[PDB]
Ligand binder design. Structure first.
Ligand SMILES: [Mg+2]
Ligand SMILES: [Mg+2]
Ligand SMILES: [Mg+2]
Ligand SMILES: [Mg+2]
Ligand SMILES: [Zn+2]
Ligand SMILES: [Zn+2]
Ligand SMILES: [Zn+2]
Ligand SMILES: [Zn+2]
Lengths: 203, 202, 203, 202, 203, 202, 202, 203
């Protein structure tokens, strides 16, 4: 199963020592190695062991090794509604770049001020895949889906106030988009979106 | 009493004979509005109330002559899709019956959003904006951020699957009230127009 | 976009330093500046920098600058069912006064003792807009809506016991009011209600 | 046995023939009450049980003569709207069948609350109060705070949109039990009257 | 409004000082005074001020004054399914005794072992009102309701595991009791049940 | 293959012609069971499959002769009310078709619980107990605590209001599995009997 | 405009006359697809649009000739059961109308999983895989882990009891997106094929 | 009621002293004694008193005494989807072994990599009862149910991310299994599954 994909470790349930055991075993230059959902403290416990490792604080991700160069010319656009979407957005962007994709970040363009979205519309329309990340309202996916004729993958986030229902509302909003060409992943699953986006980008 | 408001009958649960009794008793008020009045129920009603007008799409019935606008400004009724039109007309007929000029801005949902910008001057020129949308109710958020007038958003129960009979649109519109948006219950085109009329006539 | 509205900062996601940067940039006497959802500790970190700032503890709001005088004669009435509604009520009242409205506070008139509501009925009926704030039961909006012929904006609060469902029950109760002329915002969104109320009051 | 309580048949799921079998077998008890009995099912039943009375609005059927009140005091059945009347009559017919005087206080919902104060003396004079309401069920809270007698609140499934088939009214009434209010299931006019009768006849 | 009921203070939202102010104001021998939902720490802050006060730890209630004697001969039976129901059961029992009722405690008779319920059936059937308190399953109300021909008031508790949904399941179970003569209050509202039970007991 | 289990057809979504095609193709297995088969669909089916038996209450259809019990012990099917009988018969017909002796213990819900104790020896003598209940599903908890044999509980969708189409009974039965109870989906009388048969024939 | 995509009409809420108006106006585009078109509505439509083809199972209607595949690769439409076939055909007809070769892999749900392995080479050879499943939607998880191509999963509303009109399948499929799976709304066979076509034609 | 079952103590609500009182009372060699849902700290408070007791950290269970030998030849298979299922899996396995069953552990065979499940299929098919334990997706029960013709008892776990809804999704997935012969218990109830499995295994 040499799909060319880097090795991925889900560090939510793994200990800081348990992770080190996997990384040194996969340090046979198989590929670069991505570790997701890695707490900042858990990286502190790991850094003396892997001094050549890079931690992405906001994304809570850790990469060891450097992917050589983008595998494909096309890029993925990661679009977010607000600043509260920065963590899972960064998780999606770090995953896509680790998987060999160029990534264009289009942050803070929610529909409360829509000129910000129109200012960066040429960048979004030029992508081969667009990942839309939004919470509170999450209506941005429907607006983006109606403005681009490229695959859109929508990520609901759990940044909630009141009836946000820990991201449930954003999830339902994305599933019921009037605009077609939108497809959805589970709440906060920025990694998964980038995994699917990367497959689409590299055909 | 004598505070301008016409009498309103909710005909969803009331029988066609009961409606005649309420209307015949109240013909001693100027206009009378009846909401959620099925097309069959109006057929059973028309021989008895000959001065009545039925609004097919709105499922509303008026007896008496509709007044002329008491206020210069108008109310804009903005709708996302063609499905959303029944409840839109229910709001628009109520607003006109309460003495407000109504501007209809229909079928401008965000699946094609250039249509909304084409009619943006009309919406910004309103004193109150009623936004009517189903499925993902995202039209309310876009309008709320583009105008600086009170917006009342109406979620509709038109949609399929996880629309949850309008719940998704209702929750979507509720998650954007900091932008000047306020919300009414699902399909409640009457209630929105009732509030819009109070705001419009200040 | 000179709507005359003061500048508003949502301090839930902003840091105490990040806020200071925005306030000093908007200290070009554009208008007074309101900051919402500002924790008491976060204000402590900010006060040495803005010594001319006023913190409203219960409202968790911060205003810098003083709006000159009410822009309109009419007033907004802020009506609450119980003492547990005081925080979001104060957030609504501080927002409306910062936006240039006179505000009349009618607190603790829930329907468990309804004479208290009738005692202050002349004050509520005299308003141009009424904001009703209630949790636990939230039936007060339907009672107020049936007693006034002016716009009512209902705010559900998340002060819950058991089946209160963190304010969901109060939200559903307000949406299904038998009394007409009621309009609703999301849970705890006292700011938003005052924003809509202010637009109605100043026509 | 011989504890005063009449026999009760739930006719919602039972067939019109099965009901005759249960009634004909039990005509060896004094009165017999049957609840949720459709109008069509009574037509199929009337030639067989000639001594039976159907209560159209209540969808109830009694065989045998209704007793006279065993207790001086009465039960008050308070309702918010005209829609709420079917389940109100279901409770009132049950309460009368169980030997209680019933006082009907109908159509006093809080959309016009002066109507409730007009009938306040009648409600306070009851020994038990049954409150019946739909939509926002807010009538139960107002009554619970105004009387110092047990209140049993019945949520009804009449309403539209987010009424959730009576859930909103049920939750609203449940959030006010500290005031002397107790709650039964949606549309359960029988159950409320069954409890009210036990309380009334102490 | 001299209903003869003692004064009741809901101490969930009141401070330990705020409570002392109310108690000394109502210390005009109006009646005994009950305080509900009073944390153990909050009572520690209050006890130096009211040395003649009694705290009921499990019930989290505080009574000052002693009601003279039961107002009525009849008693209320407080029935619980398990030991986890002891707090709200005690809140109901302390409220009923403070309101002038004799109370018979029938604890730990859940239907997992039903002989325990049958052992105390004569006590339960002899009551004038029965309060049934149950969580996890809450099926005990339907069993009790089918065994007694006296008013049953059912209290759902929020002692939950998994699908218990913080007492929602027990609440729905009680509302749908096949046995008639059952009436329901909100989750954990042992006070409210005793308030309604006391009115029924004293007719 | 040849593991004793008869072939099973789910006829809820399958057409009356499609069923004949599946049955006619499989008549090359010993018995064939078809579940959720409407009464009208069997009328359209009977001229084509003349060796078939319809079980009206169970809405099941068997082709082929029902085997004799392969095991001495029996399965007990315990039901709370008369409404619960259709899904009870669906389970009982499946269990008999799979070669198990079935003992029916019907209408013993806890509204009158002496009835259950009258039949307690029969239930304790079973090797597996299937409990079928709606509304509050409390019968499963009482049985689970009284017998020391596997209990499989079936929630039914019969009930009104907050029954939530059987959700309340399902959750009630799920909150008592520590007592030896296990649960299947709402109305799934087949699934319970399928598991009971595997347990009974050990 | 001129971006390859055919015009799409949602005929669920639109009337049979309104559809003719939209189609007759747009016959000035190459193909036109109409979704959720009832069989009765097509009968009322056929005398007016004689060049139209109805796809009974898919409830779709095409006017104009279906193009030939613009791309070598094909899309695989994988389904769990025979019930799932209508929405599967809705996706497959859309995909073929958008110019993609479609490979149908039907009735391979995990109740018998050898069937899926029999057709595993066909699925792995696709460029995009659409998985269609109801009840427990577990087929999407198995496929997502076996192929290294984009998988779009469609939950269907076919099922009984706690299926919750497809919610259980939707949530099940959403809990496995880390494996290369992406999800659309319940019954939304069109939406999946719309996205699959964009991915397939890169 | 000499069913031969060991005595079981639910230590979630019992104190460390309260447990010691029950164990010494049941130390009349009635059988071995199992204690479930026992926190690691609560065992520390208990160990000086029962020095012959065995704590199962992952299972959070405590057994005192040693069951003599398996009561039946047949074994129960405990199958899990991921490592996050290890706690309730161990609770089920420790309960079944304490009740006198041989237990075969088949861990980490979720359908994200299904060859792992096929590698151990002979072990699973050889069982007399299979307990399937899964969260996140919980689709493994339907796959196992369709592969074995023996009783399957499915346990949903509350190891959740986003829309996992604290195990609700896994519970609904298991109840709606297309594969027949599956039966379900409440969330995290590994004990209950083993209790039912043990009865089936020992016929
Ligand atoms: Mg605005
Ligand atoms: Mg009272
Ligand atoms: Mg047992
Ligand atoms: Mg993959
Ligand atoms: Zn839209
Ligand atoms: Zn009302
Ligand atoms: Zn029952
Ligand atoms: Zn399946």
């Amino acid at each position: 199963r040499r799909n060319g994909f880097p090795e991925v470790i889900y560090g939510a349930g793994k200990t800081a020592t348990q992770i080190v055991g996997i990384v040194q075993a996969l340090s046979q230059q198989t590929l670069p190695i991505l570790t997701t959902r890695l707490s900042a403290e858990k990286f502190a416990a790991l850094q003396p062991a892997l001094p050549t490792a890079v931690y992405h604080a906001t994304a809570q991700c850790m990469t060891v090794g450097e992917q050589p160069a983008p595998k494909t010319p096309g890029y993925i656009a990661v679009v977010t509604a607000g600043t509260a979407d920065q963590p899972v957005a960064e998780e999606a962007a770090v995953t896509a770049e680790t998987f060999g994709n160029r990534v264009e970040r289009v942050y803070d363009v929610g529909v409360a001020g829509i000129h910000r979205l129109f200012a960066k519309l040429d960048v979004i329309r030029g992508a081969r895949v667009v990942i839309v990340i939004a919470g509170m309202e999450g209506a941005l996916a429907s607006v983006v889906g109606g403005l681009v004729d490229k695959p859109v993958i929508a990520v609901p986030t759990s940044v909630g106030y009141g009836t946000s229902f820990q991201g449930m509302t954003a999830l339902l909003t994305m599933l019921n988009s009037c605009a077609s060409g939108i497809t959805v992943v589970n709440i906060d699953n920025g990694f998964g979106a980038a995994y699917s986006a990367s497959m689409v980008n590299q055909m």
